[PDB]
């Protein structure tokens, strides 16, 4: 009765539902609906003060699913949670959605790497893909769990929306100067390196393709026996060697290195965030600050930036953080002359 | 001295070295400021 | 000195260039 299910279940159809198929689909579906549902129908100004959905008229960009209220900490307020008391409508008013999406959605990510392992032992392929996938999953937990945990509550976690994400970015720039963190820098390295590879590899191929392979001279053909494939490593090599100066020519390395760059990066970036979770940042250069105070005729871009930040913080924290209730008198605000 | 459970051959090639150093120095460069300041 | 150290690690990254581009191991089809 077991093995049968194994097979019925693992039966090779259009959409492969494996053993993992049970976690993945129920969770990855609800995590999607959860978004789309609130996105289109819920308001989060009882909890955040802003407009959450389309029901109030936000554009796609503006609309999002906002985080619970800071007064609640990390209480997973599920429908039967002592706080919502089973009343759905309010369970939504309070943001009980965020938790929904992140949790179900956390498992969908669990299911998707599991489904990536299944398929590799049925087909008999390497598990590598399933491993490359850890980076995003890291980034995810790093972001939406670790970080909110370290801080005051769920509120400070990214908000599920478009703009609501841009606001995240900026937030980080002001209080953390995340851009100065070295970890985000490396992360910034792989992502841009992933795209640099994606271009050179894809262009080199396409352009070194074998001559006359098609009389008509367009390129829409292949076959299994086409063992050699459509292009030259020998020419690419020399091409690069004489243009760029370097070119390790060994296909197997080229592709793996293409795993290393992107993925290696996001792991750092995720590390970098486990750090901020604890307000532990790379927001300062003692050496400079010191000479920055004992002397007023000395300035560097390091400094000019630290100024913008305070501007971000002063103006953006009273509307952005409703719970403390900041009252800041016009004069008080930092402000360059004439603006 | 007389055990054979081990495959006793360790290798790194010319190329692997270049990338090895390119990483350590670049890596060092970056962090330098942070250790220092 | 905070300096020479950013320079030192610099001259190496250029020394590594020359040596990597002009003294690399050959890519041959003798196979």
């Amino acid at each position: 009765w077991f093995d049968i299910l194994d097979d019925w279940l693992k039966r090779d159809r259009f959409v492969f539902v494996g053993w993992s198929g049970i976690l993945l689909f129920p969770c990855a579906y609800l995590a999607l609906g959860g978004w789309l549902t609130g996105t289109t129908f819920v308001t989060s100004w009882y909890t955040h003060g802003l407009a959450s959905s389309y029901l109030e008229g936000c554009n796609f960009l503006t609309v999002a699913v906002s985080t619970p209220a800071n007064s609640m900490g990390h209480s997973l307020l599920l429908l039967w949670g002592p706080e919502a008391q089973g009343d759905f409508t309010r369970w939504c008013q309070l943001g009980g959605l965020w938790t929904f999406i992140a949790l179900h959605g956390a498992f969908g990510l669990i299911g998707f790497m599991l489904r990536q392992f299944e398929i590799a032992r049925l087909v008999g392929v390497r598990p590598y893909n399933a491993i490359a996938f850890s980076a995003p999953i890291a980034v995810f937990v790093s972001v939406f769990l670790i970080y909110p945990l370290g801080q005051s509550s769920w509120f400070f976690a990214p908000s599920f929306g478009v703009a609501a994400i841009f606001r995240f970015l900026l937030f980080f720039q002001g209080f953390h100067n995340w851009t100065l963190n070295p970890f985000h820098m490396m992360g910034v390295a792989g992502v841009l390196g992933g795209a640099l590879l994606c271009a050179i590899h894809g262009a080199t191929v396409e352009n070194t393709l074998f001559q006359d392979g098609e009389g008509a001279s367009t390129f829409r053909a292949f076959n299994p026996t086409q063992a050699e494939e459509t292009y030259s490593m020998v020419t690419a090599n020399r091409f690069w060697s004489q243009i760029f100066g370097i070119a390790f020519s060994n296909k197997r390395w080229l592709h793996f290195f293409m795993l290393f760059v992107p993925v290696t990066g996001l792991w750092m970036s995720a590390i970098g965030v486990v750090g901020l979770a604890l307000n532990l940042r790379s927001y300062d250069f003692i050496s400079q600050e010191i000479r920055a105070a004992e002397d007023p005729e000395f300035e560097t871009f390091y400094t000019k930036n630290l100024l913008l930040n305070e501007g971000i913080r002063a103006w953006m924290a009273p509307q952005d953080q409703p719970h403390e209730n900041f009252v800041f008198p016009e004069e008080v605000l930092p402000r360059g002359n004439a603006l | 001295m007389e055990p054979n459970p081990n495959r006793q051959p360790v290798e790194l090639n010319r190329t692997s070295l270049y990338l090895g150093l390119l990483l350590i120095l670049v890596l060092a460069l970056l962090f330098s400021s942070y250790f220092f300041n | 000195m905070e300096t020479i150290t950013y320079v030192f690690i610099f001259a190496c990254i250029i020394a590594l260039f020359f040596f990597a581009i002009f003294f690399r191991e050959p890519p041959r089809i003798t196979k």
């Binding site: 000479r291 | 290798e11 790194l12 070295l17 090895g20 350590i24 220092f36 | 000195m1 150290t5 690690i9």
Partner: peptide, 30 residues
């Protein structure tokens, strides 16, 4: 300026150990 002198030793060892390390292995290779 004011810098923590331990950086030097830190940043120098970062340069050497992993490097020395690899230098030993590229010789055994040949």
């Amino acid at each position: 300026m004011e810098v923590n002198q331990l950086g030097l030793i830190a940043t120098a060892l970062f340069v050497l150990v992993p490097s020395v390390f690899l230098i030993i292995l590229y010789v055994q290779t040949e």
